[PDB]
């Protein structure tokens, strides 16, 4: 599809050594700002297609990765330069703010 839904094993095997810009969303079922930011991410997955990797990760059905990275607030978008953490921001941004954040890292 447009945004790849990952698990912990798929994250560890196809993110840390994927050699590309990877953006991972952290989302829960009961909230809710992720429901706000998800059509924005669906629009960015078509606007900036062919230059980065956009993915989502459920913190509820995958209890491994999020305690390893230590997340205090959701939603939080992490930019992965060759898998490792390069820059991130906490909150539910807008489309222009997210495009500015992606342009401020490339």
């Amino acid at each position: 599809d447009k945004i790849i839904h990952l698990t912990d094993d798929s994250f560890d095997t196809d993110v840390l050594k994927a050699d590309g810009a990877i953006l991972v969303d952290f989302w829960a079922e009961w909230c809710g700002p992720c429901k706000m930011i998800a059509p924005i991410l669906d629009e960015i997955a078509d606007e900036y297609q062919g230059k980065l990797t956009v993915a989502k990760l459920n913190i509820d059905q995958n209890p491994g990765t999020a305690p390893k990275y230590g997340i205090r607030g959701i939603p939080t978008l992490l930019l992965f330069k060759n898998g490792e953490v390069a820059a991130t921001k906490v909150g539910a941004l807008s489309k222009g703010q997210l495009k500015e954040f992606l342009d401020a890292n490339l």
């Binding site: 909230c31 205090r72 991130t88 941004l93 703010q97």
Partner: protein, 702 residues
């Protein structure tokens, strides 16, 4: 008659200096100021007042002032200073006897009290209530240290005598005098025809109500119990603590390998709205929105101002106007009902019984009632209940703030205070070491907790032998009181029937109940008017079965409804009905007891409890006072160096640590004779019975 007050350097365990003592006399109407060097003259003035047949009045003198003066007189002059019982009058006991209900009258006056004295029987609280309070010595000393500049220590003001402490003692004496005159302004408890400030001690103890003498004898006996104390077994408690800590770690490991962790939404501050319109939505947990943040920082260079050079990136990782959900990685705590309830929802169980704030009832009944599809979690529910029980035992024993290992002094003896009046019904309450919280003989490890409590842990001061503990209990107290009340209705038939075997065992056979204490719980719930849901919860069945048993016992004993109707027509005027409340007019706020107190009533369906609990409390109180008086007059000696000591008066049951089994048998026979004397004195229409046991600890004595 004189009114005195003292000032020591510490409490009863560390008193070593007499600062000042102020005496007011009615025959002179003058203030008698003393010095730290006037301790012998103070004791000689007290002995002259006793020899003149006068009455000396203190404030909480039975618990602190009299043994403090005794210990100071011993450790300073080595002279035997022992004041008689009848020549000492407490204002605290008279205040607790006359004004027995402060919580229902202190509001409307809080405009006076600072706020911390809400329902306080202290000496300063009456100083604010009587509008006679000129500062506080502790606040004056704190202001003094903050004026000098050095730091405040809470014990330095009781180390040095000064004019501030002298004037504070004068203020204490005049507040005690005004409070004594206010309590002697009463008409029911004290007849105003005789000026009680100018009588003899025999005239004062004879020309008043019996309740004042009962209260003062009870206060003297409880102060003797406080200076006696109760033994302890430190090594057994520490071994039990190590065992319960190891089992707690074992069950915590089992529950952490059974269950897992999750995320908790705790941390939100601001408000979330509808993203389309702006309407608030209660269907989301609390989230937070920052107010300062962005992407680029402030332009400082010339090309940054021109937009050529990009500014610094957002390091703080928050943007102004981006709502997020501040969560935390909560670990599953089995001591958290909310966590247990969350896991039972995730297991697939639907809660039924709810509370008033939305969260469902989580207790032992519903933890037995939960039936899920997973056998491992179904077995782990029992581990959760056992973890909660062991956590309760450890929090009672050592890890709590009011811990036994924290409150046992250097002699190995527990020193826990007891309020004589306490509740409004007359039943005594227990202070910060609470001896009522000690578990029974069927709870897990409560047998070891009661086996760690015995009189065998105190060796003799001369021979060095473990003593013998004697425990005496009464059976069917309130039930025989009920027979005494409704004998005038049923011609004494229930009082004749109650003496035929054990009434609780007979009710257990009649109701087909498993245990005798379950039968006791059921008959007490039927006596005090429980609802059908409560009766079904006790019997383990439905409300139809509860109504069947209620109607069966009500048709068996029809006089209870007649007694309730008699009380309802006696003290209650009318009763209105609100949808959430119940406006009931009485025009009679109290019921005269056996001695004649104004025992305050709270509820029209609790006036029966207000009667029966006060009756049982007065019977037990005058019973132990008469038992102590008879054991004194038969020739024995009360104390550690004597023969016996009182160490437990929790409810309707005493523990007596004697020297030999023959002495314990004499104490049991004396208690039986005192019980028969009370039953003959108060015109008891039935027979009163006791039950004495003889064991080394509570494992045999109860």
């Amino acid at each position: 008659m004189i009114v005195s007050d003292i000032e020591a350097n510490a409490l009863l365990e560390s008193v070593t200096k007499f600062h000042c003592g102020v005496i007011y006399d009615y025959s002179t109407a003058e203030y008698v100021s003393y010095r730290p060097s006037d301790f012998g003259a103070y004791l000689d003035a007290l002995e002259a007042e006793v020899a003149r047949g006068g009455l000396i009045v203190f404030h909480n003198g039975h618990k602190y002032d009299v043994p403090a003066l005794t210990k100071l007189a011993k450790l300073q002059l080595n002279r035997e200073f022992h004041l008689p019982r009848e020549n000492c009058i407490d204002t605290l006991v008279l205040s607790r006897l006359i004004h027995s209900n402060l919580k229902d009258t202190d509001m409307g006056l809080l405009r006076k009290l600072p706020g911390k004295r809400f329902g306080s029987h202290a000496l300063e609280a009456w100083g604010y209530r009587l509008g006679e309070m000129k500062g506080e010595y502790k606040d004056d000393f704190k202001r003094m240290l903050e004026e000098q500049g050095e730091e405040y220590v809470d014990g330095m003001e009781w180390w040095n005598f000064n004019e501030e402490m002298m004037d504070y003692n004068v203020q204490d004496v005049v507040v005690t005098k005004a409070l004594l005159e206010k309590l002697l302004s009463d008409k029911h408890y004290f007849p105003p025809e005789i000026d009680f400030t100018d009588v003899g001690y025999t005239t004062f103890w004879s020309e008043s109500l019996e309740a004042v003498d009962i209260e003062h004898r009870a206060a003297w006996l409880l102060a003797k119990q406080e200076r006696n104390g109760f033994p302890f077994d430190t090594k057994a408690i520490e071994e039990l603590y190590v065992e319960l800590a190891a089992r707690r770690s074992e069950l915590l490991r089992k529950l952490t390998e059974t269950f897992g962790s999750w995320y908790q939404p705790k941390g939100g501050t601001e408000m979330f709205c509808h993203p389309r319109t702006g309407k608030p939505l209660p269907k989301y947990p609390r989230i937070k929105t920052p107010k300062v943040g962005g992407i680029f920082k402030k332009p400082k260079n010339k090309a940054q101002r021109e937009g050529r050079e990009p500014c610094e990136l957002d390091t703080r990782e928050y943007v102004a106007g981006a709502p997020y959900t501040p969560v935390e990685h909560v670990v599953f705590n089995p001591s958290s009902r909310d966590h247990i309830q969350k896991k039972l929802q995730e297991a697939g169980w639907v809660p039924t019984k709810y509370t008033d704030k939305g969260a469902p009832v989580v207790d032992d009944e519903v933890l037995e009632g939960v039936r899920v599809d997973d056998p491992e979690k179904q077995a782990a529910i029992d581990l959760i209940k056992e973890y909660l029980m062991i956590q309760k035992r450890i929090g009672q024993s050592a890890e709590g703030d009011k811990a036994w290992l924290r409150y046992v002094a250097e002699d190995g003896k527990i020193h826990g205070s007891v309020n004589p009046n306490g509740a409004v019904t007359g039943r005594a309450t227990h202070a910060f070491p609470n001896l009522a919280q000690i578990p029974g003989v069927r709870s897990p490890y409560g047998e070891q907790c009661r086996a760690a409590f015995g009189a065998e842990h105190h060796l003799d001061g001369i021979t060095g032998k473990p003593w013998v503990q004697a425990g005496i209990d009464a059976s069917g107290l309130e039930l025989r009181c009920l027979a005494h009340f409704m004998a005038r209705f049923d011609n004494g038939e229930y009082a004749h029937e109650i003496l035929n075997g054990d009434i609780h065992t007979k009710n257990q056979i009649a109701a087909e109940l498993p245990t005798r204490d379950n039968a006791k719980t059921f008959i007490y719930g039927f006596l005090y008017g429980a609802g059908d849901e409560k009766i079904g919860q006790i019997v383990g069945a439905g409300k139809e079965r509860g109504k069947e048993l209620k109607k069966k016992f009500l048709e068996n004993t029809p006089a209870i409804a007649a007694l309730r109707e008699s009380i309802q027509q006696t003290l209650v005027e009318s009763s209105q009905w609100v949808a959430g409340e119940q406006q009931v007019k009485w025009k009679r706020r109290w019921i005269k007891g056996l001695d004649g107190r104004k025992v305050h009533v709270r509820s029209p369906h609790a006036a029966l409890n207000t009667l029966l609990q006060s009756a049982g409390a007065l019977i037990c109180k005058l019973w132990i006072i008469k038992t102590e008086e008879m054991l004194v007059e038969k020739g024995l000696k009360h104390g550690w160096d004597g023969d016996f000591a009182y160490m437990a008066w929790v409810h309707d049951e005493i523990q007596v640590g004697c020297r030999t089994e023959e002495i314990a048998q004499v104490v049991i026979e004396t208690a039986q004779e005192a019980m028969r004397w009370v039953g003959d004195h108060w015109n008891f229409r039935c027979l009163l019975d006791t039950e004495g046991k003889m064991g080394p600890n509570w494992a045999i004595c109860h």
